[PDB]
């Protein structure tokens, strides 16, 4: 079904107006960005349109949280139209605001392959559905408002194109709300349509998910959803130790416990079984007198527990051997959260081997997908990016499609 939407490639943009969502929140370090990789991923899109003779390119994205009220001295898009025009090696025009009559006339005939930048969408109650005012209150939408907000958007092109699949999990006007015959996904939601659809349709065997982070509560349904998909299950990070507490009896002294968490532990390991599939956790760590990046660091095993006053913040030696012997036997694997603090280099060693091994199993054919957020940060970090088969670009989108939601945005594009 992830298969049968409507794609770039597929569509005839030759001389089209088009109207594109794109991500452009990058990271400012004030009035400079800091890192400009959401706005390089964007450009093949783009190029792909100006070059089959798409009539013009009208973007629009959103940056920061500037919660429905204008704020261009913090969260403008100013600064992102400038780093656009070098890396396109073409003009940009940017206008201030994102719909509106000026806009719209701006918009509606524009000289042919002309790449205009809309001003954040966010600025706009309308986008999200809600906001908040100036002295920190709540306010909500109004329909007609929203209504008048959607239907100048969608006078901006003819055909609509998706390649922000970091928002596709939010109803927002933007994903939802645009109303032309055809709605594609770009080649950016293209990478990520067709990989999870390996995840979650037609998997290759054996199957590995790798489960990190530090909550068990939070991700309770994409565990219950990935044990209806895998052959095995590394569960690592702090997420571990409720585990590891609830069924070992073992010591964790000030490490992570989940509480609610706890009372469902043997629940999952009874589906688990059921299924037939393998969890591996680990067997030693390394440990911390305190939560910090100087902090002292020790050892421990299952079988040692760990000393009060003392927390695991990362897999020791023997658990990462048994991690890579998982890996080794995997023929599809998608990882979401570390297996560690990968925060801090005394403690992200146990991630940095996993990495390691899954870069190396990429290489020998196991196609490998990493989930958004952290877990999409270590790549980068280490630059294995392109040593993967694919790093989502959406954490929280990437984690509602892996506990087997419908995704607003996604499901609003056409079939097909
Ligand atoms: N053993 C551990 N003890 C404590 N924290 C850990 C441990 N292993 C990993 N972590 C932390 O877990 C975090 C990732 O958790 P998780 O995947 O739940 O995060 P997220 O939901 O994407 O973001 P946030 O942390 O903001 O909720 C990392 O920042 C990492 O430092
Ligand atoms: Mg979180």
């Given at each position: 079904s992830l298969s049968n939407k409507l794609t770039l490639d597929k569509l005839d943009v030759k001389g089209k107006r088009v109207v594109m969502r794109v991500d452009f929140n990058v990271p400012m370090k004030n009035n400079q960005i800091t890192n400009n990789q959401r706005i390089k991923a964007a450009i093949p899109s783009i190029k792909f349109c100006l070059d089959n003779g798409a009539k013009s390119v009208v973007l629009m994205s959103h940056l920061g949280r500037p919660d429905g009220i204008p704020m261009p001295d913090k969260y403008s898009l100013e600064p992102v139209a400038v780093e656009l025009k070098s890396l396109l090696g073409k003009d940009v025009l940017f206008l201030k605001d994102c719909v509106g009559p000026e806009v719209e006339k701006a918009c509606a005939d524009p000289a042919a392959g002309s790449v205009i930048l809309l001003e954040n969408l966010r600025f706009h109650v309308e986008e999200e559905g809600k906001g908040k005012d100036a002295s920190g209150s709540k306010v909500k939408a109004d329909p007609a408002k929203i209504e008048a907000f959607r239907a100048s958007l969608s006078k901006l092109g003819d055909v609509y194109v998706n390649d922000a699949f970091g928002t596709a999990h939010r109803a927002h006007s933007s994903m939802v709300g645009?109303?032309?015959?055809?709605?594609?996904?770009?080649?950016?939601?293209?990478?990520?349509?067709?990989?999870?659809?390996?995840?979650?349709?037609?998997?290759?065997?054996?199957?590995?998910?790798?489960?990190?982070?530090?909550?068990?509560?939070?991700?309770?349904?994409?565990?219950?959803?990935?044990?209806?998909?895998?052959?095995?299950?590394?569960?690592?990070?702090?997420?571990?130790?409720?585990?590891?507490?609830?069924?070992?009896?073992?010591?964790?002294?000030?490490?992570?416990?989940?509480?609610?968490?706890?009372?469902?532990?043997?629940?999952?390991?009874?589906?688990?079984?059921?299924?037939?599939?393998?969890?591996?956790?680990?067997?030693?760590?390394?440990?911390?007198?305190?939560?910090?990046?100087?902090?002292?660091?020790?050892?421990?095993?299952?079988?040692?527990?760990?000393?009060?006053?003392?927390?695991?913040?990362?897999?020791?030696?023997?658990?990462?051997?048994?991690?890579?012997?998982?890996?080794?036997?995997?023929?599809?694997?998608?990882?979401?959260?570390?297996?560690?603090?990968?925060?801090?280099?005394?403690?992200?060693?146990?991630?940095?081997?996993?990495?390691?091994?899954?870069?190396?199993?990429?290489?020998?054919?196991?196609?490998?997908?990493?989930?958004?957020?952290?877990?999409?940060?270590?790549?980068?970090?280490?630059?294995?990016?392109?040593?993967?088969?694919?790093?989502?670009?959406?954490?929280?989108?990437?984690?509602?499609?892996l506990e087997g939601k419908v995704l607003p945005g996604v499901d609003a594009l056409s079939n097909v």
């Open positions: 645009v109303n032309l015959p055809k709605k594609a996904g770009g080649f950016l939601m293209k990478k990520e349509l067709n990989y999870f659809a390996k995840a979650l349709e037609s998997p290759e065997r054996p199957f590995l998910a790798i489960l990190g982070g530090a909550k068990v509560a939070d991700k309770i349904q994409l565990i219950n959803n990935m044990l209806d998909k895998v052959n095995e299950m590394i569960i690592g990070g702090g997420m571990a130790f409720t585990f590891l507490k609830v069924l070992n009896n073992m010591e964790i002294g000030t490490s992570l416990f989940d509480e609610e968490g706890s009372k469902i532990v043997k629940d999952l390991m009874s589906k688990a079984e059921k299924n037939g599939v393998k969890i591996t956790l680990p067997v030693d760590f390394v440990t911390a007198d305190k939560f910090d990046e100087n902090a002292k660091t020790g050892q421990a095993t299952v079988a040692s527990g760990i000393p009060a006053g003392w927390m695991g913040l990362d897999c020791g030696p023997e658990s990462s051997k048994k991690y890579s012997e998982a890996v080794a036997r995997a023929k599809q694997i998608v990882w979401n959260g570390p297996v560690g603090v990968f925060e801090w280099e005394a403690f992200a060693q146990g991630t940095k081997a996993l990495m390691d091994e899954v870069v190396k199993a990429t290489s020998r054919g196991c196609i490998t997908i990493i989930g958004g957020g952290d877990t999409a940060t270590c790549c980068a970090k280490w630059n294995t990016e392109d040593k993967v088969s694919h790093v989502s670009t959406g954490g929280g989108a990437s984690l509602e499609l």
